[PDB]
Amino acid sequence: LTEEQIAEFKEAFSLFDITTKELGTVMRSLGQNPTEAELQDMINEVGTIDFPEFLTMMARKMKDTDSEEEIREAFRVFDKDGNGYISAAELRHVMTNLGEKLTDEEVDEMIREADIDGDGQVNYEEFVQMMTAK
């Protein structure tokens, strides 16, 4: 974290001198709207949180955002009609024919997870969240 970054984080933290529901409010003042489940995960990776732990939580959240964005943008390349959906067949084709090709067993598993409702369509934002859940 840069000094510039720590400054902004101290600023937001100071405004709520911290409770668990207080964190929710702090996150809101940083423009985020995490679900309660999301908030619990952030807390767990570390009901009162010390500053230096907030910094650690913020650093981690920004890293997570980056990787979420990287994967989302990677999917966007293949959603050529820009509707947020990629057909399971196309996903299967891309995964087995490009890059570090997935095996048949790996790709079967991907489709099992990526197309839960089994309609032959993948909501890739959904699947991005699944892969970044941990």
């Binding site: 990677a74 891309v94 995964m95 890059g99 997935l102």
Partner: protein, 153 residues
């Protein structure tokens, strides 16, 4: 100076001279190729108007830039796409590239630099994107596998 109806501005011999000067910085052995991973730097290093200043990925990926194995781009393809960016799109343009290739061939005794097209910048971009997804999925699976293993504890 050369100018067309579609040109952002005219080009002169100095621009083409400048082009080779910069080329030799990236291709000191005059192999006639640069690796695609320095193309962005090369494009940014030219003088205006041939220059494509960073960020320049979008412009580059929109150009016809064929890549020989592996991930190597010929100076002639680069030269043509960059000058077309400036001079603008035209009918003759496609025919003009064929003629340029012929003139380059007649002047060039070094035949070793001729290699067939294998891929493109855009295709490479898709390979990279697929790998981002593949890596994410393998990380996901491995995290899961260890997770299941640890349950027994």
């Amino acid at each position: 100076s050369v100018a067309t109806e579609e040109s952002t501005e005219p080009l002169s011999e100095d621009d083409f001279d400048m082009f080779y000067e910069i080329w030799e910085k990236f291709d000191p052995e005059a192999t006639q190729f640069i690796e695609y991973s320095v193309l962005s730097d090369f494009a940014d290093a030219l003088s205006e108007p041939l220059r494509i200043a960073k960020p320049n990925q979008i412009s580059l990926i929109n150009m016809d830039l064929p890549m020989v194995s592996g991930d190597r781009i010929h100076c002639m393809d680069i030269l043509f796409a960059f000058t077309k960016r400036v001079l603008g799109e035209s009918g003759e343009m496609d025919a003009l590239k064929i003629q340029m290739e012929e003139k380059f061939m007649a002047a060039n005794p070094s035949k070793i630099s001729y290699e067939p097209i294998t891929t493109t910048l855009r295709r490479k971009h898709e390979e990279v994107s697929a790998m981002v997804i593949q890596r994410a999925f393998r990380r996901h699976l491995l995290q899961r596998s260890l997770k299941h293993a640890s349950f027994l504890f």
